Amino acid sequence: HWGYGKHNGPEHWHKDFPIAKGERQSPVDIDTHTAKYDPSLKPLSVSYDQATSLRILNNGHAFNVEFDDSQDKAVLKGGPLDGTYRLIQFHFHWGSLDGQGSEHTVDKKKYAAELHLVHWNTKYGDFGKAVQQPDGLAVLGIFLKVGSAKPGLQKVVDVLDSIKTKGKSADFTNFDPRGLLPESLDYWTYPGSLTTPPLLECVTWIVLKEPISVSSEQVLKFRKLNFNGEGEPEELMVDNWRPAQPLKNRQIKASFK
Numbered sequence: 001h002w003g004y005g006k007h008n009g010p011e012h013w014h015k016d017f018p019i020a021k022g023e024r025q026s027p028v029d030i031d032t033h034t035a036k037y038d039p040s041l042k043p044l045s046v047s048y049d050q051a052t053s054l055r056i057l058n059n060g061h062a063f064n065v066e067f068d069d070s071q072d073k074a075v076l077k078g079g080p081l082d083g084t085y086r087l088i089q090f091h092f093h094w095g096s097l098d099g100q101g102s103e104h105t106v107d108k109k110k111y112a113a114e115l116h117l118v119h120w121n122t123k124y125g126d127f128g129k130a131v132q133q134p135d136g137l138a139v140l141g142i143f144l145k146v147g148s149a150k151p152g153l154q155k156v157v158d159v160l161d162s163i164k165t166k167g168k169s170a171d172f173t174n175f176d177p178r179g180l181l182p183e184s185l186d187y188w189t190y191p192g193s194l195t196t197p198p199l200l201e202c203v204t205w206i207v208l209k210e211p212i213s214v215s216s217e218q219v220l221k222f223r224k225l226n227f228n229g230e231g232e233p234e235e236l237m238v239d240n241w242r243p244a245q246p247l248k249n250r251q252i253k254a255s256f257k
């Protein structure tokens with residue numbers, strides 16, 4: 001019964017998930033002047049050409065577009081990563097207003113939303129094992145700002161009416177996640193966690209510098225989703241973001257000067 005409300009929100013999570021106050025929690029503020037360029041960081045390799053999307057699910061906190069991760073079909077490699085990480089799902093976090101919604105912040109700036117492409121390290125065999133490892137996951141984070149529409153997002157937006165409430169899913173095949181990527185793959189990277197319960201400290205975060213633009217109409221449709229199940233009182237799925245957590249003993253590295 002954790003959530004994003006007054007009585008079950010991020011400030012309450014530590015009672016069920018003590019790791020909420022751990023040493024490598026996410027998200028964080030990215031202080032751009034303190035992040036250090038790391039010349040040894042390899043270029044990021046995003047290989048989504050063979051992606052097989054399957055389904056879209058409202059899980060009561062966000063919506064997940066799920067992929068077939070039983071073969072190396074859509075993988076993330078390079079950058080700070082050792083080995084091959086398979087795409088399992090993507091989802092977003094967003095606000096009730098355009099001035100908030102992202103989890104990561106940049107010099108304390110909040111974006112309207114944040115896209116998370118979640119990948120797991122193939123050396124651990126499946127997602128459940130990977131989340132128990134400090135290098136188990138790689139999440140590619142992409143900021144959304146409100147401006148021009150993102151054409152590649154529209155197919156997602158248009159199916160949302162069919163998964164309005166918690167527990168609803170719909171077929172979502174042949175979706176190409178390359179249409180959600182910005183031009184540049186310049187990034188910041190640091191060791192962190194899942195940003196929702198169970199908050200496991202198993203994530204290498206790769207957060208892209210360049211946001212994508214989405215239209216006001218696109219984000220408004222995100223905000224029509226429901227946290228609640230069908231036949232329960234309507235509570236709009238908005239402000240499903242965790243705020244910035246203490247950086248503690250971590251350095252954020254940049255791939256770019």
Ligand SMILES: Cc1ccc(S(=O)(=O)NC(=O)Nc2ccc(S(N)(=O)=O)nc2)cc1
Nearest residue numbers: 116118127128131139193194195196197198
């Ligand atoms: C092993 C296992 C653990 C947790 C789940 S889950 O579906 O209940 N939770 C989960 O997937 N959490 C999660 C949390 C945060 C993020 S995030 N927001 O950091 O990208 N992605 C996924 C499933 C299998």
Ligand SMILES: [Zn+2]
Nearest residue numbers: 091093116195
């Ligand atoms: Zn997320």
